[PDB]
Write a protein that binds this ligand. Structure first.
Ligand code: JQB
Ligand code: JQB
Lengths: 200, 213
């Protein structure tokens, strides 16, 4: 059984959401949420004050506080497995140029905190990352290596393109070996790092 | 000026995109995002989009005939066809930059175990096709990946959405819950501030992303 709370200034974005409940909270309920960065630089930083009040009410010492950020530890399938057995996830979604670092630092004095990134690209805020994290985690909740090769279904010939004949053969050993070969070839081509080789 | 067409059996999932788009960008004709229900192109009264995998195994595979008809209608020779898949090439910021100048992206969102491979292979004989993954985790389908791709791409298109890791950021108040903003940031010594930030970036990168080194 898992509870997930998502905190955002754009609750409208989270709309795409009995063993798990997901609740979305408008951060503005606890209040200008942003100001210029100390030290200078472009854009705005979310003030810690409003976040502190929201998280005070929502979190407990048992909470795993998840903070999407481009500067986070990588969120991976291993992370998804790890979080799948948590009782309570709180996902703090930033906007602007991010959240004052003291929010995570203050939270870590009371609960476990995880700053994570879902990939090496830049988003406008944490909401899309929250949707990715929720989806990856929820499909693993109790009671719910190499790249996959290609898949095929009927008809066996389509637009003059045939399903690989081995897949029609009924020979499990040959099919397994072919699928292994397809996966090896794909992994080498697209993700050689997974097999311990240099990236392109 | 970019057109994005998304094809999915869950068009409601792409609602956040339409909500993120500023009216000024749309009325300026800078961007148009359209979402299409794949079932519009099904052949049967049961609106079937999936079937059992050749060679056996768990799960289902999306039908090539349905997808073929959908992409035939939506794509042209100039389309960049984007196919999210956990077996894809990595989608990165470089990818987002490259795609930000495209006239027409079509994002084909799969579900189940994915789409019959002949769909992409056939499309690739007459348009540019890109199978990509947004990260090293498994999703239920391509919709969340489409949201990520659309956001990362469109934020790079001028006026549409409104190395090393970045170190910590701070703003008002100068003291909060016993924690002071690092005094160097209030020093007015901007060369020193830059050096402090560089070191913070170096430390965070070593700790969180040693692969980047
Ligand atoms: N997880 C994940 C992320 C994010 C992501 C997450 C949360 C926020 C909150 C604000 N922004 C924009 C932003 C933050 C910091 C610096 N510059 C910016 O433009 C975010 C980006 N971007 N890319 C990922 N993989
Ligand atoms: N981009 C990206 C993705 C996806 C992703 C994309 C598209 C589809 C279509 C079906 N599924 C589910 C699925 C595919 C293969 C095997 N098992 C499954 O459960 C997808 C997953 N998962 N993880 C990423 N980084």
């Amino acid at each position: 059984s898992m509870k997930i709370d998502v905190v955002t200034i754009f609750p409208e974005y989270l709309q795409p959401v009995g063993l798990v409940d997901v609740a979305v909270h408008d951060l503005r309920r606890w209040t200008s949420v942003d100001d210029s960065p100390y030290g200078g630089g472009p854009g705005m930083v979310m003030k810690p004050t409003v976040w502190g009040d929201a998280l005070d009410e929502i979190c407990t010492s048992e909470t795993l506080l998840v903070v999407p950020t481009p500067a986070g530890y990588p969120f991976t399938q291993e992370t998804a497995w790890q979080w799948s057995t948590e009782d309570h996830l709180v996902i703090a979604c930033g906007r602007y140029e991010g959240i004052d670092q003291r929010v995570a630092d203050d939270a870590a004095t009371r609960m476990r905190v995880r700053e994570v990134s879902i990939g090496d690209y830049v988003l406008n805020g944490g909401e899309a990352a929250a949707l990715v994290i929720i989806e990856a985690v929820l499909r693993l909740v109790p009671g719910v290596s190499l790249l996959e090769g290609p898949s095929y279904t009927r008809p066996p010939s389509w637009r003059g393109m045939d399903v690989p004949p081995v897949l029609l053969s009924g020979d499990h050993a040959k099919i397994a070996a072919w699928r292994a070969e397809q996966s090896r070839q794909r992994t080498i081509e697209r993700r050689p790092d997974l097999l311990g080789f240099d990236s392109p």
